[PDB]
């Protein structure tokens, strides 16, 4: 699968993948708000036929009280494309882009606690550490773990 930065031309197919795989769905003007505010951040995994199979919708959260940090607004991969590390490869490309452009320090996300497999991928494969428990975060009334990933190692790995 081809992995590449997401351009405005891609966002309508990204929304299609979203509404296929996730219950957390968004409007297109929001998809514009990402690609036109932090364009370097969002990435897609595409077919030979241009069919997006996985995506990452990334964002720089605006907090002046502390260090700059990134936030995954949404991430999903089609079930038809598991065991390909697209989740990992996509999170890596977005994380680096958070460092190059905005000197980002960490990166955050929220996830269903009933989804251990996804959680385990963040926990073991991508070094995502839980920072808090935010209960009934989703409409389902399900508690979401507010994970975090230290980007100090990755940034030093590139300062070389």
């Amino acid at each position: 699968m081809n992995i590449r930065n997401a351009r405005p031309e891609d966002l309508m197919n990204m929304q299609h993948c979203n509404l296929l795989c996730l219950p957390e769905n968004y409007q297109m003007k929001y998809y514009f708000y990402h690609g036109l505010s932090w364009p370097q951040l969002s990435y897609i995994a595409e077919d030979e036929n241009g069919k997006i199979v996985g995506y990452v919708l990334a964002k720089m959260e605006e907090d002046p009280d502390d260090v700059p940090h990134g936030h995954i607004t949404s991430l999903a991969v089609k079930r038809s494309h598991r065991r390909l590390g697209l989740a990992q490869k996509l999170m890596d490309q977005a994380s680096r882009a958070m460092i190059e452009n905005f000197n980002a320090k960490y990166v955050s996300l929220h996830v269903r606690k009933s989804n251990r497999a996804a959680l385990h991928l963040y926990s073991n494969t991508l070094n995502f550490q839980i920072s808090e428990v935010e209960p009934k975060y989703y409409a389902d009334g399900e508690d979401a773990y507010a994970m975090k990933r230290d980007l100090t190692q990755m940034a030093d790995e590139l300062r070389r």
């Binding site: 968004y26 409007q27 003007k29 929001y30 708000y33 929220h110 975060y137």
Partner: protein
């Protein structure tokens, strides 16, 4: 507490200040614009000068706008471009 981006999409229309710029040798460049703006206005003035001095048989208009379903302004554009030949225009519209 999933915002769905509603709160975020309000940062777009929020009030902001018009940023300004250091004044450095600008009237030099600002005069160069009026050179390219004038030669734009000149070139555009002479394009329509040639188009205006063309015969415009009205019955040709009502035929093109109805057979091609285009508008009067577009039909007038095609006719003047073709120096008032309906066929030589009605043909290019088909293309």
């Amino acid at each position: 507490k999933h915002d769905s981006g509603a709160a975020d999409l309000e940062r777009v229309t929020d009030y902001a200040e018009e940023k300004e710029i250091q004044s450095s040798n600008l009237e030099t460049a600002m005069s160069v614009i009026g050179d390219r703006r004038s030669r734009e206005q000149k070139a555009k003035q002479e394009r329509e000068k040639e188009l205006a001095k063309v015969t415009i048989k009205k019955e040709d208009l009502e035929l093109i706008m109805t057979e091609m379903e285009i508008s009067r302004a577009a039909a007038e554009r095609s006719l003047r471009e073709h120096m008032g030949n309906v066929v030589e225009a009605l043909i290019a519209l088909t293309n």
